[PDB]
């Protein structure tokens, strides 16, 4: 069963909601992936930063295999013995009172919106159903009707309305706009990514996150930080907001929370917010199941025990330093923090980010474009400096082969 | 670490969005669960019908263990070698052109709403953003802002607005109301459960589903059948709609699609609907990952090879027959199809569905109430007639001990 067979068969029987890069992967471990013909590749996408810990990390695998022989799902109608241990661990690890477990990133975001609105009505005293949540243009937090309603990307929302009311949108990295938006006492929260991933790794100016926290406190507005892709060592800290010593009111985690072995996500906040939701008022069939909790506990331990945040910090400097050695004729910008990085391609009609990624694949490195001029470079955080330097050679050899 | 310790620790560190039955489960297999003190129980909830195949079915476990050592997540940016095999299998199994894989039940529902609206705008010709979707009162399809906006249950939606526009609600099991609702040419779809699970196992009159299909065809409206809990042999057929030989335009699957080992869900429909969504316009980080696909393929094979639908059919008759032998003084109604069943309790102030389930737990059987007068009985479909008869004894011994 060849790569071409694999492409054709997905095309026949599967929805066309994606156009993947033409590579048919069968196997992966650490920083490497192998296709069906056995060719070996560096993974510079990390499955959108879900395999921070490397593919099939043995510690997380063994947690999965130990638990799958015991108990995988009771539903939340009864207690299991794993969920709390995970809850005690993750809430102490991040220093919040409580966690609400969900499965996917967008589910954690919907949860955060529901906490914000409920807190707005039952604590802040907003009249029912006047609550607003402010978002930054360029945000991406998933594909539900609610998530695309806050998007400014036409490919997310066009053809899918009517849209959820009560969302306001302001420019990203703009504190005067946030100050103007928070004049409305019916605003309950501001939700924002510490670095906008899908918008093309857009890093806000130093002090932005400190100013956000100040404005939210001053106006009695919840600061929701979406760390589903910036968190868990990807940017060189436990949370990207740690760079400015800022404590959000709600933190969203996902992707790397499981090492890529299970959809696990989390909403962290204190009691005065979390307990606004009463029993029966929110949940999920698979949220908090024992199998995902065991996996999450191990995937957090791997991040801590192997010191991947400081590894991501020190190697990201190296990565960005080498990438700017590329000629400004061809690479117009280098952006990133820790091991979440991007380069912008001077998109002539000679060439584009898609053709670059095709040739990168030919030379053994997997990455993928985000707007035809942007290419993300985000390898697993278990990569070593010598392995990283080999990868930079493949990027050099590719960019300069045009 | 005792059951009481387990309760207290979840209470301290976890959100209070649930009030589970006081039982702390550590282990499960087949139809049985064991708590931390070793006591053994019949599972008559099946984790809300996600473990149709029994807890930790060895065939599904071995599929998980084989794949977790190989590759668990590439993201949809590249191809993996498993996804298509699953897509070919499930689309031929249910006789639709295509499948769109997602993770949770509510994600499949949001997907169905987005397909319906997109089809309404790009095929039916509804002006943008006038599309409507009709739902039946009592529906439950999840906890996103969109899903609670169609709910008529105040505990789902109260305090969580403002709500998604464009949803109409009609009585369930009411064909004249549907005919009245579909007079609006801007309606794109009607979404409905063949049996309303969360509303208390509410079974519509014979012919209802045939009348729905006729009205939807006559008015050029998509018939979306939510089988996330009625499907996959739970009611005695592959799809609950199979009882009336009705083919919906969109079918939603979830829960049992994985055997309870992984959150896997699916949206099935033909090309003229499915291909309204173009690349980049919908997706999910974990949807379609190789690990969940291997698990789903095995969990479907277990349903087919062990003939659980006919087993569920023949044992559900037995179950409902015995349950009506209970005195009408105390059990006001018995409802269900296949192995999805409920009894209604004459809720005096002497006693209620919660106290019944407490005493059922004391006598070794796990079930749980849904509105304080309704108790669901839904054991795994691998149960045997002799095991089922033992369980009925525990239900008899409990109801008559009051
Ligand atoms: C900050 C943030 N909050 C929530 C979610 C929802 O999480 P989810 O519901 O998917 O679990 C996401 C998900 N982002 C995805 C979805 C995935 C895909 O489209 O396949 C590609 C991906 C992505 C990343 F991560 F950067 C990119 F390409 F869009 F740019 C997210 O980035
Ligand atoms: C027909 C249908 N369509 C979609 C979904 C969403 O699927 P999901 O997003 O959860 O994967 C569901 C989920 N129903 C759940 C959620 C779970 C919980 O509240 O913990 C209890 C449960 C339930 C069942 F199954 F009957 C009950 F108690 F609400 F009555 C569903 O029934
Ligand atoms: O009307 C618009 O332009 C947009 N309105 C919303 C976003 O601001 C929904 O998309 C309001 O929630
Ligand atoms: O206004 C209402 O009573 C309800 N409106 C909606 C449901 O019909 C949203 O909850 C419209 O989508």
From Swiss-Prot, chains A, B:
Pathway annotation: Amino-acid biosynthesis; L-proline biosynthesis; L-glutamate 5-semialdehyde from L-ornithine: step 1/1
Cofactor(s), names only, from the UniProt record: pyridoxal 5'-phosphate
Modified residues (N6-acetyllysine): 12, 29, 70, 325, 349, 355, 368, 384
SUPFAM superfamilies with a match to the protein in the record: PLP-dependent transferases
PROSITE patterns (UniProt xref): AA_TRANSFER_CLASS_3 (PS00600)
Phenotype when changing residue 316 to D: In HOGA; decreased protein abundance
InterPro entries reported for this sequence: Aminotrans_3, Aminotrans_3_PPA_site, Class-III_PLP-dep_AT, Orn_aminotrans, PyrdxlP-dep_Trfase, PyrdxlP-dep_Trfase_major, PyrdxlP-dep_Trfase_small
GO cellular component terms listed in the entry, alphabetical order: cytoplasm; mitochondrial matrix; mitochondrion; nucleoplasm
Entry EC number(s): 2.6.1.13
Effect of residue 204 to L: In HOGA; no effect on protein abundance
Subcellular location: Mitochondrion matrix
Record family assignment: Belongs to the class-III pyridoxal-phosphate-dependent aminotransferase family.
Annotated disorder: Hyperornithinemia with gyrate atrophy of choroid and retina: A disorder clinically characterized by a triad of progressive chorioretinal degeneration, early cataract formation, and type II muscle fiber atrophy. Characteristic chorioretinal atrophy with progressive constriction of the visual fields leads to blindness at the latest during the sixth decade of life. Patients generally have normal intelligence.
The protein's assembly and partners: Homohexamer.
Protein's recorded name: Ornithine aminotransferase, mitochondrial
Higher taxonomy: Eukaryota, Metazoa, Chordata, Craniata, Vertebrata
Gene: OAT
């Amino acid at each position: 069963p060849t790569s071409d067979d694999i492409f054709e068969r997905e095309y026949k029987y599967g929805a066309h909601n994606y156009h993947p890069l033409p590579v048919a992967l069968e196997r992966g471990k650490g920083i490497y992936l192998w296709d069906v013909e056995g060719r070996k590749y560096f993974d510079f996408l990390s499955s959108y930063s879900a395999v921070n810990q490397g593919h099939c990390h043995p510690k997380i695998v063994n947690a999965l295999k130990s638990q799958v022989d015991k108990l995988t799902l009771t539903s939340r109608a009864f207690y299991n013995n794993v969920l709390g241990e995970y809850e005690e661990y993750i809430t102490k690890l991040f220093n919040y009172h409580k966690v609400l477990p969900m499965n996917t990133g967008v589910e954690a975001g919907e949860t955060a919106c529901k906490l914000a609105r409920k807190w707005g009505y039952t604590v802040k005293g907003i009249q029912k159903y006047k609550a607003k949540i402010v978002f930054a243009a360029g945000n991406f937090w998933g594909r539900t009707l609610s998530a695309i309603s806050s998007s400014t990307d036409p490919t997310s929302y066009d053809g899918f309305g009517p849209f959820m009311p009560g969302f306001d949108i302001i420019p990203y990295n703009d504190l005067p706009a946030l100050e103007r938006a928070l004049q409305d006492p019916n605003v309950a929260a501001f939700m924002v990514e510490p670095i906008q991933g899908e918008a093309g790794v857009v890093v806000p100016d130093p002090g932005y996150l400190m100013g956000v926290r100040e404005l939210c406190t001053r106006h009695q507005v919840l600061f929701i930080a979406d760390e589903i892709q910036t968190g868990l060592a990807r940017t060189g800290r436990w949370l990207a907001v740690d760079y400015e010593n800022v404590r959000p009111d709600i933190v969203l985690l996902g992707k790397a929370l499981s090492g890529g072995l299970y959809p696990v996500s989390a909403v962290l906040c204190d009691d005065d917010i979390m307990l606004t939701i009463k029993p029966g008022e929110h949940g999920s069939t698979y949220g908090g199941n024992p199998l995902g909790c065991r996996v999450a506990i191990a995937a957090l331990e791997v991040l801590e025990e192997e010191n991947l945040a400081e590894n991501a910090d020190k190697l990201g400097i190296i990565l960005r330093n080498e990438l700017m050695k590329l000629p400004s004729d061809v690479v117009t910008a280098v952006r990133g923090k820790g091991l979440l990085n991007a380069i912008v391609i001077k998109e002539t009609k000679d060439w584009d980010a898609w053709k670059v990624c095709l040739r990168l694949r030919d030379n053994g490195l997997l990455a993928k474009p985000t707007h035809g001029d942007i290419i993300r470079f985000a390898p697993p955080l278990v990569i070593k400096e010598d392995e990283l330097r080999e990868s930079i050679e493949i990027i050099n050899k590719t960019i300069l082969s045009f």
